[PDB]
Amino acid sequence: GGKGHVPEYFVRGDLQSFYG
């Protein structure tokens, strides 16, 4: 949803953000 390093859920393809 933003920036960081651990992803926005366990999906990828057009995700470039992260959380905890």
- Tokens representing 8 are 């926005």
Rounded CA separation 13/20 (Å):
20
Q: Could you tell me which residues come within 8 angstroms of residue 19 by beta carbon, excluding any fewer than 6 positions away?
A: 1, 4, 6, 7, 8
* Closest listed residue to residue 20, CA positions, set 10, 12, 11, 8: 8
CB 19 within 8 A of CB 9: no
Rounded CA separation 8/13 (Å):
11
Indicate which technique resolved this structure.
Answer: NMR
